[PDB]
Amino acid sequence: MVTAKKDENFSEWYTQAIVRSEMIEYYDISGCYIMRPWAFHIWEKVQRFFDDEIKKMGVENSYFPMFVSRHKLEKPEVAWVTHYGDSPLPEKIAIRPTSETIMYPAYAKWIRSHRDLPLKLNQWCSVVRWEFKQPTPFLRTREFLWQEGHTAHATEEEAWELVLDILELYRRWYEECLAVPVIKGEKSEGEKFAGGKKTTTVEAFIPENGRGIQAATSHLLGTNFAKMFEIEFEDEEGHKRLVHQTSWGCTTRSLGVMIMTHGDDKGLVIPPRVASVQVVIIPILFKDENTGEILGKCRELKTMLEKADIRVRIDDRSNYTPGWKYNHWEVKGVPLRLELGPKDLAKGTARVVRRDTGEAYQISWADLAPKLLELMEGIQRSLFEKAKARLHEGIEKISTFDEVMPALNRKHLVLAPWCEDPESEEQIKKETQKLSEIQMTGAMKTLCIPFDQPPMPEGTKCFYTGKPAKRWTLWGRSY
Amino acid sequence: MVTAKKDENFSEWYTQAIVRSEMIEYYDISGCYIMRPWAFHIWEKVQRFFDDEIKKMGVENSYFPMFVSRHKLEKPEVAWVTHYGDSPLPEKIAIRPTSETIMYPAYAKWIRSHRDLPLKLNQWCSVVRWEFKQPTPFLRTREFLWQEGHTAHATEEEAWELVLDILELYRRWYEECLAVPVIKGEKSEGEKFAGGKKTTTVEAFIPENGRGIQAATSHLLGTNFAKMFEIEFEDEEGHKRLVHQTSWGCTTRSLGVMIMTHGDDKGLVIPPRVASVQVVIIPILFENTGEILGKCRELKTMLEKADIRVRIDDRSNYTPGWKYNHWEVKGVPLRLELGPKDLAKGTARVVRRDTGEAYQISWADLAPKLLELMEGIQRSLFEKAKARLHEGIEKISTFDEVMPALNRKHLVLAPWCEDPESEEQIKKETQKLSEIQAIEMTGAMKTLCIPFDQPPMPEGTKCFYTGKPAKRWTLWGRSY
Numbered sequence: 001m002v003t004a005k006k007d008e009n010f011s012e013w014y015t016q017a018i019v020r021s022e023m024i025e026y027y028d029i030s031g032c033y034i035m036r037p038w039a040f041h042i043w044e045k046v047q048r049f050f051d052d053e054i055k056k057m058g059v060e061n062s063y064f065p066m067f068v069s070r071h072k073l074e075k076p077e078v079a080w081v082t083h084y085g086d087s088p089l090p091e092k093i094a095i096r097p098t099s100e101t102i103m104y105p106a107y108a109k110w111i112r113s114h115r116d117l118p119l120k121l122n123q124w125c126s127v128v129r130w131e132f133k134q135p136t137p138f139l140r141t142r143e144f145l146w147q148e149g150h151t152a153h154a155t156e157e158e159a160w161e162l163v164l165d166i167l168e169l170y171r172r173w174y175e176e177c178l179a180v181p182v183i184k185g186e187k188s189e190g191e192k193f194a195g196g197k198k199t200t201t202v203e204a205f206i207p208e209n210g211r212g213i214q215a216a217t218s219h220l221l222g223t224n225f226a227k228m229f230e231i232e233f234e235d236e237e238g239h240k241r242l243v244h245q246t247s248w249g250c251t252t253r254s255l256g257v258m259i260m261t262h263g264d265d266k267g268l269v270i271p272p273r274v275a276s277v278q279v280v281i282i283p284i285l286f287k288d289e290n291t292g293e294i295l296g297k298c299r300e301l302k303t304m305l306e307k308a309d310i311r312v313r314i315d316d317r318s319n320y321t322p323g324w325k326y327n328h329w330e331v332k333g334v335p336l337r338l339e340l341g342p343k344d345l346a347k348g349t350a351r352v353v354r355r356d357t358g359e360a361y362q363i364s365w366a367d368l369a370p371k372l373l374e375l376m377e378g379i380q381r382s383l384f385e386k387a388k389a390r391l392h393e394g395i396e397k398i399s400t401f402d403e404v405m406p407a408l409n410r411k412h413l414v415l416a417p418w419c420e421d422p423e424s425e426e427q428i429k430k431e432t433q434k435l436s437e438i439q440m441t442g443a444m445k446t447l448c449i450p451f452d453q454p455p456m457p458e459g460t461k462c463f464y465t466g467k468p469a470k471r472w473t474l475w476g477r478s479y
Numbered sequence: 480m481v482t483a484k485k486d487e488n489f490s491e492w493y494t495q496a497i498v499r500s501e502m503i504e505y506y507d508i509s510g511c512y513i514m515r516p517w518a519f520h521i522w523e524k525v526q527r528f529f530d531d532e533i534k535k536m537g538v539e540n541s542y543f544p545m546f547v548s549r550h551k552l553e554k555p556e557v558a559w560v561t562h563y564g565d566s567p568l569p570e571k572i573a574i575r576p577t578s579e580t581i582m583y584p585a586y587a588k589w590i591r592s593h594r595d596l597p598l599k600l601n602q603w604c605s606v607v608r609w610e611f612k613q614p615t616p617f618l619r620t621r622e623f624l625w626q627e628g629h630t631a632h633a634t635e636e637e638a639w640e641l642v643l644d645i646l647e648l649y650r651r652w653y654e655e656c657l658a659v660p661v662i663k664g665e666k667s668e669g670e671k672f673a674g675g676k677k678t679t680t681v682e683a684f685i686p687e688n689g690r691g692i693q694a695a696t697s698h699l700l701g702t703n704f705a706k707m708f709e710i711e712f713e714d715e716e717g718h719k720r721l722v723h724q725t726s727w728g729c730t731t732r733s734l735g736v737m738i739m740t741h742g743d744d745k746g747l748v749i750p751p752r753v754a755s756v757q758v759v760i761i762p763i764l765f766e767n768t769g770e771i772l773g774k775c776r777e778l779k780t781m782l783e784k785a786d787i788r789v790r791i792d793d794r795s796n797y798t799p800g801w802k803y804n805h806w807e808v809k810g811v812p813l814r815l816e817l818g819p820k821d822l823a824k825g826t827a828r829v830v831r832r833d834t835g836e837a838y839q840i841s842w843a844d845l846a847p848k849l850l851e852l853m854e855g856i857q858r859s860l861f862e863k864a865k866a867r868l869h870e871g872i873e874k875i876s877t878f879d880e881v882m883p884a885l886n887r888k889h890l891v892l893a894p895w896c897e898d899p900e901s902e903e904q905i906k907k908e909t910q911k912l913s914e915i916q917a918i919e920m921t922g923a924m925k926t927l928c929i930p931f932d933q934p935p936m937p938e939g940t941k942c943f944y945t946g947k948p949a950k951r952w953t954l955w956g957r958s959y
């Protein structure tokens with residue numbers, strides 16, 4: 001069970017939560033962890049939703065090799081294979097950190113005419129970024145699972161609308177499945193993906209350590225990579241034009257984020273929409289009191305709730321006390337826990353405890369399926385809405401730079417008018433980092449320029465340079 | 480179009496077929512190939528089938544790192560990571576070729592009491608087996624996708640029952656989804672997984688080189704790994720015992736097999752159950768308004784409501800007949816032709832890809848009859864294959880009848896004594912008999928499997944080689 005406290009020592013709390021809930025297991029190679037079934041259930045669920053939604057868009061899944069030649073890569077932190085067994089490769093090959101240098105030549109080969117567009121591929125794989133720093137399970141790891149999508153189109157308007165559609169699917173992944181609120185915005189030109197035209201992004205906020213984290217990203221690559229890799233088509237009139245590319249990505253970091261958003265001092269709290277066990281049925285057995293009837297009814301209740309597509313498990317393992325089972329499913333975060341013991345056998349009801357709030361209900365057996373649907377909807381919405389309020393309580397609207405340092409001290413982000421000069425963002429990072437040193441990184445940086453822009457009074461000056469401000473920008477310490 | 484002929488030039492036919500089908504793209508690193516959507520949808524299909532069945536058996540999914548210490552790996556085809564950027568690494572690390580050494584330490588840590596058993600885990604991933612031999616797409620490659628399942632049980636009976644259940648799921652994977660017939664059997668103690676106690680397998684046959692190929696595998700590991708890694712539990716009486724483990728896998732080789740099992744001189748054929756598109760609607764077009772396309776879209780929704788997978792090929796500059804050949808090569812089980820004649824009679828022309836038989840169907844009658852055909856197709860494809868299979872097996876009793884059989888690209892079902900010595904001697908002698916034939920891919924014949932279904936073994940029957948008392952019948956032939 002979890003001993004540490006979320007608002008007192010976040011780091012050890014998080015470690016305990018993930019470990020005690022059986023989601024991860026440590027490994028002798030630093031930077032890689034093991035994803036036990038409990039976490040992978042959740043992953044499977046969001047992968048299913050994203051997959052169905054992108055298949056609805058014509059995107060098709062595929063698989064490109066893990067390996068890229070050195071020649072075709074330096075056309076850093078990439079991992080190099082030099083030997084098989086005991087013989088060295090004639091050329092070292094690297095392991096993929098992202099798949100552009102692998103797929104894009106194939107794109108060059110496959111695209112000749114307008115009729116071959118759009119071209120929309122996704123792939124669900126593992127990548128390797130071997131930064132020699134300190135990892136954070138889910139959040140920052142040397143190997144991780146993601147999906148990545150790459151499309152090429154005949155026009156930039158098409159590409160751009162797909163960028164937006166995909167980032168909307170990413171908003172739904174987080175807010176709608178994992179109950180984590182996020183912010184849609186656009187990356188600064190010092191933070192955007194280089195040689196993309198424009199990066200869009202969903203951002204999240206960890207209040208317990210006042211930090212920003214990127215959740216997913218969708219790039220408008222435009223035509224830079226087409227020039228690079230010579231991906232041309234012939235339009236209707238017979239002209240050779242460059243294609244307009246997008247790519248987009250989202251990883252298991254999402255599970256990390258969800259743990260921090262909903263976790264509490266007893267452990268995990270798993271939003272029902274992604275819960276593999278939404279309801280655990282715990283038979284209360286002691287002194288051979290009514291065990292045959294208790295199990296009879298528990299299995300009947302299971303078939304009842306399964307008819308309503310509630311995902312139900314009866315914890316009838318003989319070698320565990322009920323109280324151990326309670327703590328087990330609590331630390332694990334099963335949304336709803338249903339207790340049936342011999343005294344309920346004559347009541348015709350049963351006791352239901354919701355994990356998020358701990359409230360208890362006495363519900364009839366006939367009334368179980370619909371009331372449990374209802375509670376799960378309410379848990380899902382309320383997980384989300386409490387999180388969304390914490391998010392917006394953590395953001396401060398400022399006018400001048402004087403307001404920054406107090407705000408970061410309250411573990412908050414700042415929304416400020418900005419002129420969007422790239423060198424000013426770096427001046428800002430350095431200034432704030434040094435001020436932080438007068439007492440994990442202390443520097444503050446841009447997170448995104450929110451799509452949702454609040455009102456911009458005329459003659460608003462950039463909070464740092466005093467120049468005329470162009471857009472509100474979200475800044476904060478980061479992950 | 481596919482220039483090669485399937486049984487005349489099998490090699491060129493095979494690569495011609497998988498390339499012009501758009502199933503693979505080649506790559507600038509030997510051993511690796513790009514798996515394109517037309518093929519990956521099939522991998523998606525069988526992965527869903529099998530994932531659901533093992534989820535029904537209580538098996539859960541997980542993910543383990545792709546790297547091993549040399550320390551843990553060594554306790555010649557392994558890909559070794561040495562550097563990041565330009566700095567060496569303290570210790571080189573290896574890309575997994577399988578994940579026993581990655582998982583069993585964790586297992587040893589997670590299992591302490593009978594409470595914790597059985598432990599059932601699976602994972603979908605890829606592995607690297609960097610062999611310096613000539614790869615073959617799908618069939619033998621340097622990086623390939625698979626699933627490896629690893630369980631641990633209290634008793635050998637539970638372990639064994641699980642082994643056989645998984646091998647039956649592999650049977651269904653090939654026969655029910657892939658329409659590919661296979662044979663369940665047991666591996667000779669020479670062909671079994673070392674440090675395993677018994678290996679079971681499903682084998683497959685390729686008529687055009689008479690070659691046998693292992694299709695899936697399911698291992699009774701017993702307790703050897705349990706001693707290696709110290710995976711132990713305490714029973715209800717408090718005594719400390721070793722776990723009996725199983726492991727089992729299957730790869731994208733299953734797709735190559737499928738190709739080779741059903742392809743014809745025209746190209747691929749894909750069983751309806753796993754085909755990406757089940758029906759291609761070909762508009763007969765050359766311009767376009769007059770709404771043939773509208774009617775196509777109507778048909779498309781009518782057919783999706785029966786859960787059929789449909790694609791309208793409305794590409795502008797291609798010819799109807801070019802489209803016919805295109806989807807012919809790809810292997811779409813059913814082609815729906817719509818032109819102005821069909822619009823004027825409310826009928827459609829449907830051509831099944833297996834036999835080429837055509838059918839005229841009114842638009843109303845469309846969705847049911849297609850369902851009746853796909854199923855027919857799915858049965859037909861599997862049945863023909865089955866027959867070809869049984870025609871490539873010769874039951875023999877002497878070694879003399881062996882080398883005739885191999886020349887016909889057949890497999891032998893001979894009575895054997897089962898000491899591995901004899902297997903080794905047969906392999907060497909058959910190879911050099913192949914070479915003395917060749918004075919005028921190797922010729923070595925080995926044990927494919929010891930089939931589970933054993934025809935009657937009369938008393939006094941002598942092994943077809945040693946001449947000692949035969950124990951069981953065994954399937955031999957050349958291998959992949």
Ligand SMILES: Cc1cc(N2CC[C@@](C#N)(C3(C)CC3)C2=O)cc(C(=O)NCc2cc(F)cc(-c3cnn(C)c3)c2)n1
Nearest residue numbers: 131133134135139140141142144214215216249250251253
């Ligand atoms: C899981 C994951 C996820 C992500 N990202 C990046 C953006 C993205 C989003 N949205 C993607 C990829 C989806 C678009 C996402 O999820 C990044 C990393 C990572 O960069 N790992 C390497 C590493 C290892 C390590 F041991 C330590 C560090 C480390 C320590 N201090 N600092 C400053 C770094 C870094 N990892």
Ligand SMILES: Cc1cc(N2CC[C@@](C#N)(C3(C)CC3)C2=O)cc(C(=O)NCc2cc(F)cc(-c3cnn(C)c3)c2)n1
Nearest residue numbers: 608610612613614618619620621623693694695728729730
């Ligand atoms: C896709 C796949 C599949 C399989 N197998 C093996 C058994 C199994 C089955 N059933 C599994 C794993 C499921 C249990 C299966 O599918 C083996 C290989 C392979 O051995 N790859 C390396 C390699 C590279 C290479 F360039 C050439 C060769 C090569 C050339 N001649 N010879 C003798 C080898 C080998 N690859």
Ligand SMILES: O=C(C[C@H]1NCCC[C@@H]1O)Cn1cnc2cc(Br)c(Cl)cc2c1=O
Nearest residue numbers: 076077078097098148149193217247248249
């Ligand atoms: O990987 C990207 C861009 C996009 N690729 C598709 C999925 C979503 C993703 O944002 C940016 N990026 C990020 N990290 C990298 C690390 C290394 Br190592 C290399 Cl060489 C290259 C990269 C690199 O290109």
Ligand SMILES: O=C(C[C@H]1NCCC[C@@H]1O)Cn1cnc2cc(Br)c(Cl)cc2c1=O
Nearest residue numbers: 556557576577608627628672696726727728
């Ligand atoms: O891979 C196996 C045994 C089983 N692993 C689990 C999935 C099913 C599979 O049959 C045997 N084997 C086969 N090929 C290997 C290649 C290399 Br390289 C290494 Cl190090 C090890 C091995 C190795 O152990």
Ligand SMILES: [Br-]
Nearest residue numbers: 098193217249
């Ligand atoms: Br990234």
Ligand SMILES: [Br-]
Nearest residue numbers: 577672696728
């Ligand atoms: Br193997």
Ligand SMILES: [Ca+2]
Nearest residue numbers: 161162164165
């Ligand atoms: Ca849109």
Ligand SMILES: [Ca+2]
Nearest residue numbers: 393394410411
């Ligand atoms: Ca606060």
Ligand SMILES: [Cl-]
Nearest residue numbers: 044045046048
């Ligand atoms: Cl799922």
Ligand SMILES: [Cl-]
Nearest residue numbers: 290291292293
């Ligand atoms: Cl009773």
Ligand SMILES: [Cl-]
Nearest residue numbers: 273309310311
């Ligand atoms: Cl539900």
